[PDB]
């Protein structure tokens, strides 16, 4: 994609699109940057993730509105048809992200920071597919999410400190997976609690700026525990 634009120009334009809140443009620019075939820096991985999280976030919010309307009507075909249209577009965005991870971001990611980041992304976009799945592959989709999150957890436990923001965001989202997708609220609560407590005990090692980064995500873990218990 965007094969005639320079890699650095795509990156520069992705940053401009974020400033303009043009997330679909942002995602297309970062897709083009990925397809240049070079590995992504820390900042570039964040741009990729921010772009697609925004795009699919708007699609998920729309799908939920329409699914709610459709369920009320089942207590013409237009509501179902339009929910299907949005659902198909959402699935296409998830497939696009998963295809970028599989060709070839993950296999070239050797460092813990990049490999865990991409595997967390892989778990997230299978989780989004699972949110809308209802057929013969719901279980396989859930298992693909679980497997990606689990491999990322294993690496992050071995290779990153308990306060690392990627390690914390990964555990947060895997706990949401357990609660919302896998029907395992006790696993969700246990993971969030253990994650929060082990980060708390490591905060003494951090600078002021890293402390702010870690405690912000710890608060999200606490907010979920408050809702779940």
């Amino acid at each position: 994609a965007m094969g005639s634009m320079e890699r650095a120009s795509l990156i520069q334009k992705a940053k401009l699109a974020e400033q303009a809140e043009r997330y679909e443009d942002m995602a297309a620019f970062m897709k083009g940057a990925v397809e240049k075939g070079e590995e992504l820096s820390c900042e570039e991985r964040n741009l990729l993730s921010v772009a697609y999280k925004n795009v699919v976030g708007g699609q998920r919010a729309a799908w939920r509105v329409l699914s709610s309307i459709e369920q009320k009507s089942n207590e013409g075909p237009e509501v179902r048809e339009y929910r299907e249209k949005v659902e198909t577009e959402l699935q296409g965005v998830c497939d696009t992200v998963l295809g970028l991870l599989d060709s070839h971001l993950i296999k070239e990611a050797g460092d813990a920071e990049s490999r865990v980041f991409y595997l967390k992304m892989k778990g997230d976009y299978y989780r989004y597919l699972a949110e809308v799945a209802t057929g013969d592959d719901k279980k396989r989709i859930i298992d693909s999410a679980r497997s990606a999150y689990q491999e990322a957890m294993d690496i992050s436990k071995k290779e990153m400190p308990p306060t690392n923001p990627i390690r914390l965001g990964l555990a947060l989202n895997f706990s949401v997976f357990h609660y919302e997708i896998a029907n395992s609220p006790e696993e969700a609560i246990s993971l969030a609690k253990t994650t929060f407590d082990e980060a708390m005990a490591d905060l003494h090692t951090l600078s002021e700026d890293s402390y702010k980064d870690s405690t912000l995500i710890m608060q999200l873990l606490r907010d979920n525990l408050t809702l779940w218990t």
């Binding site: 974020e18 999280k53 965001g169 949401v176 609660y179 919302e180 999200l220």
Partner: peptide
Amino acid sequence: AGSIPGRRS
């Protein structure tokens, strides 16, 4: 339940 917002960077 909130996942990481991750929509600004």
